Design a protein around this ligand. Structure first.
Ligand code: NAG
Length: 307
């Protein structure tokens, strides 16, 4: 009978997060007498995973009598934090029991899905033809390999920068990406999309969206005119506030620098591009000024004179 050998037939095992991992180990001899123990890591600070003779290991279960020679284990509910190299080790009986021979080790790698991509646009709004940044973020996947793409309404974008961290080794990875997007006057109904592809994903990439309606500001055009009034000594003066977004607009009517009336747009019409239209009118050497404050921005105004 040849001397006891500890045999770990698998150099590496790959498990999906949440599943059970099987770590195989068989010993060739029953002598010398002593327990088999499982560890993660070797040398300094190795972690006891299972002890055949005593203790509680709820996650550990035996995969196989006194002539038992198979010491394979199963570990339930795997997480990325279980990744590492596992060693099956034979000890000689004693108090305490001394180490005798170690298996060659089995590397356990764990597969985790990326989290749903979160897309954030800038803090303040911008007008058409401005460039704005969007950030995309996804965490906790392994392996490190991943693919990130950006789209604006279906067209893939190219102007972006991506980072995966750690650059070094870890159990889970994160991805962070920033894309530069040029706003047009048609973006109220537009959407920016960040999609990630990973092996743990059954064909369909995870997507994160951001609606440009939250980011765009389209300033109103003003137009002040005068209408025929039946009664004499009266003129209908109108201000048309057209094609604006969002719908937050305050309008003050002025008479030679004197506040005649203030108003908030309440019932607007909508255009095909998602912007709104509104109009205010009042019955009146004299100047009339239609003064507008759109979405908390600096007042703009058109002035008009009396017949
Ligand atoms: C002033 O003109 C507007 C725009 O045509 C109209 O809707 C409004 O009713 C007019 N005011 C009066 C008193 O007719």
């Amino acid at each position: 009978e040849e001397e006891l050998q500890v045999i770990q037939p698998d150099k590496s095992v790959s498990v999906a997060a949440g599943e059970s991992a099987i770590l195989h180990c068989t010993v060739t001899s029953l002598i010398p007498v002593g327990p088999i123990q499982w560890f993660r890591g070797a040398g300094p600070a190795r972690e006891l995973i299972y002890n055949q003779k005593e203790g509680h290991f709820p996650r550990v279960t035996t995969v196989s009598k006194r002539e038992n020679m198979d010491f394979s284990i199963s570990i339930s509910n795997i997480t990325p934090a279980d990744a590492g190299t596992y060693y099956c080790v034979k000890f000689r009986k004693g108090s305490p029991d001394t180490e005798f021979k170690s298996g060659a080790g089995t590397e356990l790698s764990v597969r985790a899905k990326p989290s749903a991509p979160v897309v954030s646009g800038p803090a303040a709004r911008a007008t058409p033809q401005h460039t704005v940044s969007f950030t995309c973020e996804s965490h906790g996947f392994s392996p490190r390999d991943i693919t990130l793409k950006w789209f604006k309404n279906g067209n893939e974008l190219s102007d972006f920068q991506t980072n995966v961290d750690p650059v070094g080794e870890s159990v889970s990875y994160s991805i962070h990406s920033t894309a530069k997007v040029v706003l047009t006057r048609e973006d109220v109904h537009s959407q920016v999309i960040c999609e990630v592809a990973h092996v743990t994903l059954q064909g369909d990439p995870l997507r994160g969206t951001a609606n440009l309606s939250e980011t765009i500001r389209v300033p109103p055009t003003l137009e002040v005119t005068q209408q025929p009034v039946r009664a004499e000594n009266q003129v209908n003066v109108t201000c048309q506030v057209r094609k604006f977004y969002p719908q937050r607009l305050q309008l003050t009517w002025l008479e030679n620098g004197n506040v005649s009336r203030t108003e908030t747009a309440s019932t607007v019409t909508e255009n095909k591009d998602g912007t709104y239209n509104w109009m205010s009118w009042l019955l009146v050497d004299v100047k009339l000024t239609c003064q507008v404050e759109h979405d908390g921005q600096p007042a703009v105004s058109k002035s008009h004179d009396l017949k």
